[PDB]
Amino acid sequence: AQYEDGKQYTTLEKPVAGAPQVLEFFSFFCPHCYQFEEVLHISDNVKKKLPEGVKMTKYHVNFMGGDLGKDLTQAWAVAMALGVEDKVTVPLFEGVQKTQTIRSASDIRDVFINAGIKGEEYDAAWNSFVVKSLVAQQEKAAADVQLRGVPAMFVNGKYQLNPQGMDTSNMDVFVQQYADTVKYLSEK
C-alpha cells in the first residue's frame, strides 16, 4: 500500500483508550521540536488538513533538561491553563535553544511577563491545583505510550507518526507528507 505500518507510522503494541484524537509531545530542549515549531510549523499544517471537530492536544515532557525540564512542563501547564500557548512558545524555544537566557524558573517566568501575563496571574496559576492536575495529565499521557523520544505525535491512541521514513530534501514536501499521514490515520 501507499501508507504502510512501519513506514510513515508505527502501530502501538498497546493501544491507549480514551486518548486525545491528535496528541503531540515536545520539549523546549528538543532540537527537532524547535524546527517543528519555528521552521516547519507542523502543528499548524496538521490542523489545516484535519476535519471539523478534531481537537489537537500538545504536551510537554520531563525527560530532557533535568530540573529545568520539569519547570518547563509546569510552565506549559500554566500556558494551557491561561490559554497563552501561542504567546510563549516561540520565546521559550528561543530562550532555551537560541539565546540560552533561560536557566531558572525565574527566567521562564520572565518570558510570560514580557508576553503580557501579569505577575500575580502567573504566580497564582503556577501554584494552583488546576495546574498540578494539568502537569499530572501531561505525565500520564506520556507514561501511557512509553515515551522516550520527542517530537512525537500519536493519532487516536493507536498510531505513532514516523517522520524518519518521509523525505527530507524538501522541507515543504516533508510537512505535507506528515500532515497527509495524520489525516489518513485520522480517517482510519
Side-chain angles (χ1 to χ4, degrees):
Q2 295 274 356
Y3 294 100
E4 288 175 355
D5 183 350
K7 182 62 202 177
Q8 297 103 325
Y9 67 99
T10 53
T11 310
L12 284 177
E13 271 189 35
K14 264 237 192 271
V16 155
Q21 299 163 298
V22 175
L23 180 51
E24 201 175 333
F25 294 100
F26 79 110
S27 174
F28 285 113
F29 281 95
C30 160
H32 280 130
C33 302
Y34 187 109
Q35 293 298 319
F36 267 41
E37 171 59 34
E38 291 196 3
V39 177
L40 302 178
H41 309 280
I42 294 285
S43 300
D44 186 45
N45 280 281
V46 166
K47 174 169 193 106
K48 292 191 288 79
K49 273 180 165 179
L50 288 178
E52 149 158 337
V54 176
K55 77 146 321 170
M56 283 170 79
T57 305
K58 176 141 75 193
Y59 288 157
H60 197 269
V61 303
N62 292 340
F63 63 79
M64 302 187 70
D67 228 300
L68 257 193
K70 281 207 77 153
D71 279 327
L72 284 169
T73 299
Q74 188 160 351
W76 188 246
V78 178
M80 286 188 294
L82 299 179
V84 297
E85 298 98 320
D86 293 350
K87 296 165 182 203
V88 299
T89 294
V90 168
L92 288 169
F93 268 120
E94 306 204 334
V96 179
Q97 297 188 43
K98 191 186 178 178
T99 58
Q100 291 183 8
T101 44
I102 294 181
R103 299 195 217 83
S104 70
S106 174
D107 297 338
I108 297 169
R109 177 177 187 275
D110 284 346
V111 172
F112 284 71
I113 302 294
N114 188 51
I117 291 89
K118 290 161 43 93
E120 36 176 6
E121 188 181 14
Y122 181 87
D123 300 338
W126 182 269
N127 292 297
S128 71
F129 284 89
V130 167
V131 156
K132 295 204 193 314
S133 162
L134 224 42
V135 167
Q137 291 166 229
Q138 295 181 88
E139 296 188 16
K140 178 175 177 287
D144 283 352
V145 297
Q146 41 284 350
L147 185 74
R148 94 175 76 101
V150 287
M153 189 178 291
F154 294 88
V155 179
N156 288 314
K158 305 175 199 175
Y159 305 107
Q160 176 184 345
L161 276 284
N162 191 37
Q164 57 178 26
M166 306 178 184
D167 201 28
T168 66
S169 66
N170 185 306
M171 297 194 109
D172 296 316
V173 169
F174 170 73
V175 175
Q176 289 328 315
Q177 188 173 0
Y178 196 103
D180 288 349
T181 300
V182 177
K183 184 181 183 275
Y184 160 78
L185 292 176
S186 162
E187 293 160 3
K188 218 175 172 85

